[PDB]
Amino acid sequence: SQRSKPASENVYLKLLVKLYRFLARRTDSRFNKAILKRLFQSKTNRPPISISKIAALTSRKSASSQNKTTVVVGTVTDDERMLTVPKLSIAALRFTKSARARILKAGGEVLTLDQLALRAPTGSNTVLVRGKKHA
Amino acid sequence: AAARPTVSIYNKDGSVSSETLALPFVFKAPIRPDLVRSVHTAVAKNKRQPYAVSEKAGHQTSAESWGTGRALARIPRVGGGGTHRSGQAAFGNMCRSGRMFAPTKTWRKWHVKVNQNEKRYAIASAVAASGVPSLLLARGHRIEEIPEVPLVVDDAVQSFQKTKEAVALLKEIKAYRDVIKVANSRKLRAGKGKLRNRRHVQRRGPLVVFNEDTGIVKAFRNIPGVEIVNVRRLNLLQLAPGGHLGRFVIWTKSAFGLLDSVFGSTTEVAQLKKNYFLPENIISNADVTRLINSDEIQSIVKAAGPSRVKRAHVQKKNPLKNKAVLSRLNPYAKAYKANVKINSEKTPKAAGEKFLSVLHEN
Amino acid sequence: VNIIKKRTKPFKRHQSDRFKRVGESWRKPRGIDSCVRRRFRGTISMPKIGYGNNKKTRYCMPNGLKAFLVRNVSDVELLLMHNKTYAAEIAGNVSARKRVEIVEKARALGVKVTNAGAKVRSQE
Amino acid sequence: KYYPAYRENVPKKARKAVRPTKLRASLAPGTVCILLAGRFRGKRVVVLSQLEDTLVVTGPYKVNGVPIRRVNHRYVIATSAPKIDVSGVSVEKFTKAYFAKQKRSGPVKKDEAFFAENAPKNALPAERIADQKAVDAKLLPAIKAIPNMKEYLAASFALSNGDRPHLMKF
Amino acid sequence: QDEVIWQVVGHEFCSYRIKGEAQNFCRNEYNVTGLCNRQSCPLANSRYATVREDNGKLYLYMKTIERAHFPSKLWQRIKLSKNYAKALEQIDQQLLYWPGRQIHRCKQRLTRLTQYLLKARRLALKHQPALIPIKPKQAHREASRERKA
RNA sequence: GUACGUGAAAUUGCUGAAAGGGAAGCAUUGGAAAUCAGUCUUACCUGGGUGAGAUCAGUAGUCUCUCGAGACUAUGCA
RNA sequence: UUUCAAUGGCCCGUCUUGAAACACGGACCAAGGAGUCUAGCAUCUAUGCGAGUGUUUGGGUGAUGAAAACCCAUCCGCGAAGUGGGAACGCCCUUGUGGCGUGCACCAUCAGAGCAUAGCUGUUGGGACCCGAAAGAUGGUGAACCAUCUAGUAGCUGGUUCCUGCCGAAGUUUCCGGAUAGCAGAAACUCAGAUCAGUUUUAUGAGUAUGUAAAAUGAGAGUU
RNA sequence: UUGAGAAGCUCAGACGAGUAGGCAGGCGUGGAGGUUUGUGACGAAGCCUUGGGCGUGAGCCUGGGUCGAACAGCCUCUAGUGCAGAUCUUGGUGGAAGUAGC
RNA sequence: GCGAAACCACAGCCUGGGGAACGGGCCAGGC
RNA sequence: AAAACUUUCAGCAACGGAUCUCUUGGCUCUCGCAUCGAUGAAGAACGCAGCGAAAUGCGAUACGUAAUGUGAAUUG
C-alpha cells in the first residue's frame, strides 16, 4: 500500500503520481523523489498539518521566511484559535474550506501539488513539512 | 481549468437560439468513477425487499437418533411407520427435507448508509460526467448527431402534452437515435428473473430534466428508454446507471438555470442545499501531459535516455576461439611472437660434480 | 517464427481413470501421504509454471494465428488491420443465415476463418 | 497497397557472407569416383569440373551410360585410381543455369489440356547430346591409353561379405 | 479532459471494448487500429484522424479539440483520391504538423482499406459457389420420410 | 405413442473389432491399424491495344455544412 | 483412439506414527451435502469532511413504483479538553570536494485529529462450519408409549467442495496450563563515509587449548 | 521506429523442494444494475462424441450428432457459489446369483 | 415354476529377502 | 493361440431419470380491513351429483331455489 503505487483509487491522485514519477526520474532532485514517496503513503502516514503550524514553522527563530512555498503531502486544516493569519503560500493535496478562505483572505495563496510542480519543478525555495504522527 | 463559457439553447424545431447560458460550475466538478460506483453500490441496495426461509422448515418432522454403532450414520431418523419417512434423515443440511445450513434471516442488513456529503459528491460528479460527449459515447449512447453537449432545449418543451410532440423534438435534435437503440435492445431476460416479474430487459435512453411540470412527464414517459426527472431531486441511480458515468441528459432552459442553485459553486454555497459547497480537486489542471510536456518542466529535465534500448551482448563469444573478439579484447595479439629462440648455440651443461655426487647417492 | 509447445498431453487428475465419480479435470492432491504429491518415480506429472509456453507464441494456433470469437459481421470487421495475427472463429450459436454473411465478409477482408464451412453446403 | 500496413519487423542485418566452398583434396577433376546415392548408385564416373558446391561429373556414355550430371561432393567416394586427362575438354558451358531445371511455364488456357488433360511431354534437346558427344570424344582416348580403365568404369561398385569400409582403402 | 476521459473509459468501462485473451479490441468505428490503446482511443484523443470507407470511397476523418462538444460537427471528412500516391499526399497535407505516429497509423489504414476494396472487386469478378444453409428441421423430415419411402 | 419434452451416469443385452500362462492397472517413447486436422498459384510488377467513367473537365446546376468540405444532377471521356 | 514392445509404476482419504506398521472409511453412479447471517470490540486500508463530524427517531417531499431518490427543525453521540542528529531547500567555490545558513517528522539531551461510511483481518456473543453423547422437564395416550422445550449439553469422533504463483517455520531456551523468548512475516524509521559474521587470524594476557582486544575474507547493516 | 491500455513498452542479472501458516493473482456457478445498436425456430439451453484448437492449470472456444425456446461475453453488485470420502442424505443399479432356498 | 439376504477398495501360486507389517501388490527366483 | 469364456473399445437396443428449459406452487416483505356461536358455531357424520377417478359444490328446494346483472350457452 506504500511501495510502488498508492492503494487509492482516486483517479486524480493517480494523475499526480504519474506527474511526479516523471519528475523523480528526469530530474536529479531529492524533493521530487521525496514528494513521490509521500504520495504512495496511506492516510494514517499523512497526518494533517494545521494552518498554525505552517505559520509557526515559517516564522521560527530567525524567521526570514521570505516567500518560500510550504509543501505538505496532506491536508492543511484550520486553527481557529489563532486570530491573525500571516501571508502564507502553501501547496497541499487538500485544504479545508475554512483553511483555504483564511489563507486567501489573509494575504497569500493556496496551490495544488501540480501548480507547484510548474512553479518549482525541482522544488527550489520550498519548505517541505510534515504533520506529527503521534496523534 | 479552462472550459467552454456558455451553452446554446435549442428550440422545438431543433434550431439554435440567440440566448445562451453560462456553464454551471457543477460541470467543472471532479469526475470520480471510484466514488460514483461506491455510492451507487450502496444506493442500489436501498430498495431491496427482505427474503428468508420459513422459521420451521426442515424441523416440522419428528425424529430421534437410533444410536451409535448400529452400522448406520447416527443422524436422527423419522419415527413411526407406514410412510417411507421411516428411517429417512432430517434436521440437517445433507439430509433430504432437512434444515438448510444457516437459514436465511430477514434481519440481514439490506440497506447501507452513506455520508450525505459523499452522496452529494457522487451526484455532482455524475452531473459533470454528463457534460462530456466522450463519456456519453463510452456508456452506450447514440449521441453522434446531437447538436451540442450539454443539450439544453427551450422551456416550451415543459408543456408538451402529446407523445408525438415529444418524438418530434427528439427527431429534430437527433436524440431519437438513442430511443431507437433502446427499442431494438428489448430482449427477454435470461434466467429465473423472468419468472419473478423481470420479464424483459433493454437499454437506457435520454434523461430529460425539467424544472416545473406542465405535461412534460406525461408526454415523455411512454417513449421507450426516456426517464424524466426534476432538477431538485437528481438521482444517482439515473445519472450513473450501473455505476457507469456519462448519462445522456437533456435539460430544459429553466432546469439548466437552476443548476447553480441546486449545486452551488466551489466557493459559494448552494441555495437549495444548506451549507453545501462543490468539491475541490487534488489537481487544478488534470491534463498531466500538459504539465509534463510544458516549457516550465521540459526546460530543466536532463536529456532523456533512449526509448527501449538496444541489446548489447546478446551472445557471449569466447576470445580463445573467436579471433575477432580476441583482437577486440587484447590490442596486443597482433604482435606477440609466442615462440622465441633463446638457446641458439650455447647450451652449457650446468651441474657441478658436487651436485652430481649428492644426487647419485645410495 | 515457429510455435513450440512444451507439452501436448493434458494433466489428468490422479486416480481419475479408476473411478467414474472422479473427473479428469485436474485437482491438486492434498493428501500428505500421496506419492503423486511428493513426486516419486513413475508418478504422474503436475501442472507447474515451468510448462508455461512462450509469451510471443501463447494463444497461437498451429498455423500461427490467434483465435478471435465472432458473433456477427461487425466483429469480423475489427480484424481489418490484424488479419495476419488473428483468425475469425464464428460462435457455435450463430445461425447459418449469419455464418454465410460472416464468411463472405471475411473473404474480402482477407481474414482466415477457423470454421467457415459449418452448417452450410455449396452450390457451384 | 504499398505503404506497409503492419508492423513489418525488418530482419536485423545478418553477417553471413557467402564464401566459396572448399572441396576435398582428393576431389580433383579427372578422378574416378563412385556414386553413393541416386539412380546411378554404385556407378563409377569421371569428374569433369567442380561447381560452386557440387561436382560436374559424367561417366562415358558408351561405358556406363551416365550422362553429364551434377553430384553432391558428400555423396561421392573419390577412388585413388589413376587420373584422366580432362584439360582437353572445355567445361565453361557447365554452369548452374546449364543444369538448372527448365522453368515450369506455359500459358495454358482454360479447358483442353487444362481440363481435358492433353498435356505435352518433355524431351532432352540435341544440344545437350551434342555437348555430351564431344566429352567422350575427348575422354575415350584418355581412358583407352591406360589398361582396365574402360572395364573399370563399366563395372558397378559393391560391398561383399567381410568388407570393412573403414579399414580397406579406396 | 483527455487524461480524465481515458481513466474513466480505458480502465473502468467502455461499451466499445472487446476483452480478448491476448489483446483488447475496440468496437468504435472511428478507431484506426481496431485495438484498445491509449493512442488509438478516439474518445480519449481530442485530436484524432482515421480513414474509413463509404460505398467504395475512402475518406479521411479528422476531429479537433475545439469541436469536442458539438457531436454533429465533431468529425470532418475529405475524399481520398483513388490514386494511391495522391491519397498518401492528401493525408500528409491535411495532417500537417500532426504527430508522426498519427499520420503513420492513417497511412497504414489506407493500405488495408485499399487492399480490401481491391479484394472485394476481384471477388465480384470470380465465380464462387453460393453457401446455402442446412435446415435442421427439413433434414429430420426428409430423413424420416426417406426411411418410409 | 399416454412405460409419452430433453433423456446424463451407474448397470444390462446384442453386434463388430482387438487382446488374453494366476489380475487389471497407469505413465514415458515409438510401431502397427483405424481415423482426423491441412494447408495449395494467386497474386504482384510492368506494359500495349480497345473501349468504359469521377474524385479528370481551357465545363454548367442543386442540396447540406462552412470561400471550400461532402452529396448528387446535366454534359464531355481531349 | 485402440493395441503391442521396452522401461518404470504397492490403494485412495483419515488418524496414528521420526517414519511406516497400523487401525479405520470406500460395491457402483447421479443429485443434495458443511466458517453462514447478525450485534459489539480492536487493527489496517479506502472514501468524505475536518475542530469538528454523523441526513434516514422523526418531519418535509416524492404524479413517470411513492418502501427509492431528494431535503433538514430540534436534539444527541463521539472528539476538541533551548542544545545535538535528521527530511528538504538556498547560497557558494577548489568549483567535485566541503563549507555557510534554514531545519519538518522522529529520536537523544536540558500551534488539537478526529468523526462517519465501506471493505479486510482478528476476536467475543448468539445454533455459530457440519454430523455426531444417556437425557431431563412440562403436558398427554394406552413401567411403557407420544408431542414439545430442543438447533439442550461435545475439550471428544468423522467430514469439511476450484487453480496457479510467491514466502515458509518450529517441533524449545527460560521461567512456569500459561506469560516470555526464539523461529517466520508486515509496517514505519536510519543508514552503505555502518555495521555485521555457527569466519580464520595477529597479539595481549590468563591457564596444546582458552577468553579478550585489534589484520584477512564475505555480506550494506541496525532497529522499533 | 511509429514500441504512451505509463495499469504500457523495454533492458539486465540472479533464482526455482516444501507440511503448519502467510500473501497475491486468476477459473467456474445462481441472481442484480449497466453494456455488447449481443446470439436464437436458417435452431437458444442441455446432453453425446476415438472431430479440432487454446491455457502451466482451474477452465474456455469450436465441428458433427441429438435436441426444441430461450441465452451469453464485458464492467460492477450479490450469494443458499465449486465435493470422492462424513459406517453422509435421497434415488437408481450391480457382483454375490439364478445361489441360499421354497 | 417361483426366487432372496449378508458381504463387496481392487485383487488372488509359492520361495526367500525385504529392517516399518511387509505378502496380496515391492526386489531376485521358480511356476 | 481360432471358438467358447474373460477383458477392452465402439455401434445399436434396454435400464434409469440426471441435466436443461418452465411453473395456476411455496417463501418473504409491505399495505388495507374488523366479520363466529343457543336466531345452534367450529368440527364430525350421513346423503344429493344422469356418469363423473377423486376432489369440489350442495342439503330431501341437495354440484342448489328466489332476485339482480351480463345476454346464448353447457361440454369428458
Swiss-Prot record, chain A:
Transmembrane segments: none annotated. Keywords: Cytoplasm, Phosphoprotein, Ribonucleoprotein, Ribosomal protein. One of its GO terms (molecular function) is structural constituent of ribosome. It is found in: Cytoplasm. The modification Phosphoserine is found at S4, S52, S124. The keyword DNA-binding does not apply. The modification Phosphothreonine is found at T75, T77, T122, T126. Component of the ribosome, a large ribonucleoprotein complex responsible for the synthesis of proteins in the cell. The small ribosomal subunit (SSU) binds messenger RNAs (mRNAs) and translates the encoded message by selecting cognate aminoacyl-transfer RNA (tRNA) molecules. The large subunit (LSU) contains the ribosomal catalytic site termed the peptidyl transferase center (PTC), which catalyzes the formation of peptide bonds, thereby polymerizing the amino acids delivered by tRNAs into a polypeptide chain. There are 2 genes for eL18 in S.pombe. Belongs to the eukaryotic ribosomal protein eL18 family. This is Large ribosomal subunit protein eL18A. The lineage of its organism: Eukaryota, Fungi, Dikarya, Ascomycota, Taphrinomycotina. The chain holds residues 13 to 147 of 187 of the full protein.
Curated annotation (Swiss-Prot), chain B:
There are 2 genes for uL4 in S.pombe. One of its GO terms (cellular component) is preribosome. It comes from the Eukaryota. GO terms for molecular function: RNA binding; structural constituent of ribosome. GO terms for biological process: cytoplasmic translation. Keywords: Cytoplasm, Ribonucleoprotein, Ribosomal protein. Pfam families: Ribos_L4_asso_C, Ribosomal_L4. Component of the large ribosomal subunit (LSU). Mature yeast ribosomes consist of a small (40S) and a large (60S) subunit. The 40S small subunit contains 1 molecule of ribosomal RNA (18S rRNA) and at least 33 different proteins. The large 60S subunit contains 3 rRNA molecules (25S, 5.8S and 5S rRNA) and at least 46 different proteins. uL4 is associated with the polypeptide exit tunnel. uL4 interacts with its chaperone ACL4 and the nuclear import receptor KAP104. This is Large ribosomal subunit protein uL4B. Component of the ribosome, a large ribonucleoprotein complex responsible for the synthesis of proteins in the cell. The small ribosomal subunit (SSU) binds messenger RNAs (mRNAs) and translates the encoded message by selecting cognate aminoacyl-transfer RNA (tRNA) molecules. The large subunit (LSU) contains the ribosomal catalytic site termed the peptidyl transferase center (PTC), which catalyzes the formation of peptide bonds, thereby polymerizing the amino acids delivered by tRNAs into a polypeptide chain. Residues 279-362 are annotated as: C-terminal-extended nuclear localization signal. Gene3D superfamilies: 3.40.1370.10. Its main location: cytoplasm.
UniProtKB/Swiss-Prot annotation, chain C:
Keywords: Cytoplasm, Nucleus, Phosphoprotein, Ribonucleoprotein, Ribosomal protein. Transmembrane segments: none annotated. GO terms for cellular component: cytosol; cytosolic large ribosomal subunit; nucleus; preribosome. One of its GO terms (molecular function) is structural constituent of ribosome. It is found in: Cytoplasm; Nucleus. The modification Phosphoserine is found at S74. Pfam families: Ribosomal_L32e. InterPro entries: Ribosomal_eL32, Ribosomal_eL32_CS, Ribosomal_eL32_sf. SMART domains: Ribosomal_L32e (SM01393). GO terms for biological process: cytoplasmic translation. It comes from the Eukaryota. Belongs to the eukaryotic ribosomal protein eL32 family. Component of the large ribosomal subunit (LSU). Mature yeast ribosomes consist of a small (40S) and a large (60S) subunit. The 40S small subunit contains 1 molecule of ribosomal RNA (18S rRNA) and at least 33 different proteins. The large 60S subunit contains 3 rRNA molecules (25S, 5.8S and 5S rRNA) and at least 46 different proteins. Component of the ribosome, a large ribonucleoprotein complex responsible for the synthesis of proteins in the cell. The small ribosomal subunit (SSU) binds messenger RNAs (mRNAs) and translates the encoded message by selecting cognate aminoacyl-transfer RNA (tRNA) molecules. The large subunit (LSU) contains the ribosomal catalytic site termed the peptidyl transferase center (PTC), which catalyzes the formation of peptide bonds, thereby polymerizing the amino acids delivered by tRNAs into a polypeptide chain. The gene is rpl3202.
From Swiss-Prot, chain D:
PROSITE patterns: RIBOSOMAL_L6E (PS01170). GO terms for biological process: cytoplasmic translation; ribosome biogenesis. The modification Phosphoserine is found at S80, S90. GO terms for cellular component: cytosol; cytosolic large ribosomal subunit; nucleolus; nucleus; preribosome. GO terms for molecular function: RNA binding; structural constituent of ribosome. Component of the large ribosomal subunit (LSU). Mature yeast ribosomes consist of a small (40S) and a large (60S) subunit. The 40S small subunit contains 1 molecule of ribosomal RNA (18S rRNA) and at least 33 different proteins. The large 60S subunit contains 3 rRNA molecules (25S, 5.8S and 5S rRNA) and at least 46 different proteins. CDD domains: KOW_RPL6. InterPro entries: 60S_ribosomal_eL6, Rib_uL2_dom2, Ribosomal_eL6_CS, Ribosomal_eL6_KOW, Translation_prot_SH3-like_sf. It is found in: Cytoplasm; Nucleus; Nucleus, Nucleolus. It comes from Schizosaccharomyces pombe (strain 972 / ATCC 24843) (Fission yeast). This is Large ribosomal subunit protein eL6. Its main location: cytoplasm. The keyword Transcription does not apply. Belongs to the eukaryotic ribosomal protein eL6 family. PANTHER family: 60S RIBOSOMAL PROTEIN L6 (PTHR10715), LARGE RIBOSOMAL SUBUNIT PROTEIN EL6 (PTHR10715:SF0). Coiled coil: none annotated. Keywords: Cytoplasm, Nucleus, Phosphoprotein, Ribonucleoprotein, Ribosomal protein.
